[PDB]
Amino acid sequence: MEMEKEFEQIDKSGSWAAIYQDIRHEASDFPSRVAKLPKNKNRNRYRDVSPFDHSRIKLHQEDNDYINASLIKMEEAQRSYILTQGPLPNTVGHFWEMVWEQKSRGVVMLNRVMEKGSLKCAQYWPQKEEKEMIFEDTNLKLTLISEDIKSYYTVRQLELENLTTQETREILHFHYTTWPDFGVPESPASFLNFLFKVRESGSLSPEHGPVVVHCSAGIGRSGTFCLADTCLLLMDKRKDPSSVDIKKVLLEMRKFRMGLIQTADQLRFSYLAVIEGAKFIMGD
C-alpha cells in the first residue's frame, strides 16, 4: 500500500496511537545483560534505555569494554549506523574512542546541550580553535578546525588525534539545532535538507566506518534520522517504490536497538518526511 494513502487513512481516522502501540507490542526483546552490570551504572543516562548484547559496540580495552551504543546493520539498503546516547561527563573519552576505533567519518547530533532547562548531554567538543580538548583516560586530542553556522544546523570540522600513535583524522560534526523542545517539527523540509547535507559529505558511504548518530537517549530523534534515510534509499533501489513498508523497516531496525521512535508524533513525522523526500528520489 502506497504509504501516502496509508497516511491519509490513519490521519482521517486518527489512529496514530493505535498503530504505534502495535509496533511496541511486536518489537523484539533481546538481553542487555552487560548494560545492567553494577560497574556500568554511571555509563548509562537512562535506566530504561540499554543496548542489546548481540549488537552493542565494544570498546577496544581489556578494562571495561562497555558503551551505551548499538550497531544498526541494514542488509538490503546496504547502510550501517551507530546509534548512541548523548555522552555523559564520565563517558566523553569513551565516545571519541568509539569514533576512532570504528573509523567513522561523521557524527550527527540532533539535540541541544541544554533543553527544557536541563542538561541533555555533555559539552563534548571544543567551542574555540585555540582551546583544544584532551581526553586523558583514552589518550585522544580533539581540535576545532572550522565552524559553519546556518539557520537550521551547524557543520563543524574537527581533528581527532590518537596521541599514542600521532595519527590524525578529520571528523565532520553535523548538528541539527532547531528540533523543538516539545513535539516534532511542523514541516520536514529542514530535517530533510539536513539529511541530504550529511549524505553529500560522504559520512554515510561504505568507504568509511558507520556514522555515529545521537540525541539525548539515542532512540527517538536518532531513530527518525536512520528510518527516513533507509526508507528513501530503498525507494531508490527497488523496481516498485510503493512496496517500501515503513512499519516493517522500523521493526527490522528495532532488532538492533530498543525503543526507536518514542512517540506516535515521531512516527507520523517519519511518514511525512519519507513521503516528502520521495518527491526528489523518484525524479521530482
Complete DSSP assignment for 168-232: EEEEEEEEE----SSS--S-SHHHHHHHHHHHHTTTTSTTSBPEEEESSSSSSHHHHHHHHHHHH
Helix (H, G, I), strand (E, B) or coil at 55: helix
Helix (H, G, I), strand (E, B) or coil at 119: strand
Q: Report the binding-site residues for substrate.
A: 181, 215-221, 262
Cell numbers 511496541 label which residue? 24
Q: In sequence order, which residues have a C-beta less than 8 Å from that of residue 117 and are 6 or more positions away?
A: none
Helix (H, G, I), strand (E, B) or coil at 51: coil
Q: What angle do CA 150, 129, 110 make, to 5 degrees?
A: 40
CA–CA gap between residue 97 and residue 139 (Å, rounded): 9
Helix (H, G, I), strand (E, B) or coil at 115: strand
Integer CA distances (angstroms), 131 to 83, 104, 128, 143, 216, in order: 28, 23, 5, 8, 25
CA–CA gap between residue 214 and residue 85 (Å, rounded): 6
How far is C-alpha 133 from the geometric centre of its chain's CA atoms? 24
Query: Which amino acid makes up residue 165?
Result: T
For 141, counting Cβ atoms within 10 Å of its Cβ (0-12 exposed, 13-18 middle, 19+ buried), the class is middle
Q: Can you name the residues that pair with 142 across neighbouring β-strands?
A: 133, 160
CA–CA gap between residue 208 and residue 84 (Å, rounded): 18
CA–CA gap between residue 207 and residue 270 (Å, rounded): 27
For helices 264-281 and 246-253, give the axis angle rounded to 10 degrees: 120
CA–CA gap between residue 266 and residue 185 (Å, rounded): 9
Q: Can you name the residues that pair with 171 across neighbouring β-strands?
A: 158
CA–CA gap between residue 97 and residue 95 (Å, rounded): 5
Cβ atoms of 239 and 109 closer than 8 Å: no
Query: What is the distance in angstroms between the CA of the first residue and the CA of the last residue of the chain?
Result: 21
The Cβ of residue 18 has, within 10 Å, a number of other Cβ atoms equal to 11
Provide the 8-state DSSP code for 86: P
Cβ atoms of 272 and 188 closer than 8 Å: yes
215 assigned to active site: yes
Helices (DSSP H) in the chain: which residue ranges?
3-13, 16-26, 92-101, 189-200, 221-237, 246-253, 264-281
Instruction: State the resolution, in angstroms.
Output: 1.6
- CA torsion sign, 255 to 256 to 257 to 261? negative
The Cβ of residue 206 has, within 10 Å, a number of other Cβ atoms equal to 9
Domain span including residue 241: 1-284
CA–CA gap between residue 245 and residue 87 (Å, rounded): 33
CA–CA gap between residue 62 and residue 99 (Å, rounded): 18
CA–CA gap between residue 74 and residue 254 (Å, rounded): 11
CA–CA gap between residue 79 and residue 53 (Å, rounded): 21
Number of domains making up the chain: 1
For helices 189-200 and 221-237, give the axis angle rounded to 10 degrees: 70
Q: What is the per-residue DSSP string for 146-160?
A: EEEE-SSEEEEEEEE
Which residue of the set 121, 215, 226, 231 is catalytic? 215
The Cβ of residue 154 has, within 10 Å, a number of other Cβ atoms equal to 15
b or e along 250-277 (b: 16 or more beta carbons within 10 Å of the residue's beta carbon)? bbbbbebbbbbbbebebbbbbbbbbbbb
CA–CA gap between residue 270 and residue 264 (Å, rounded): 10
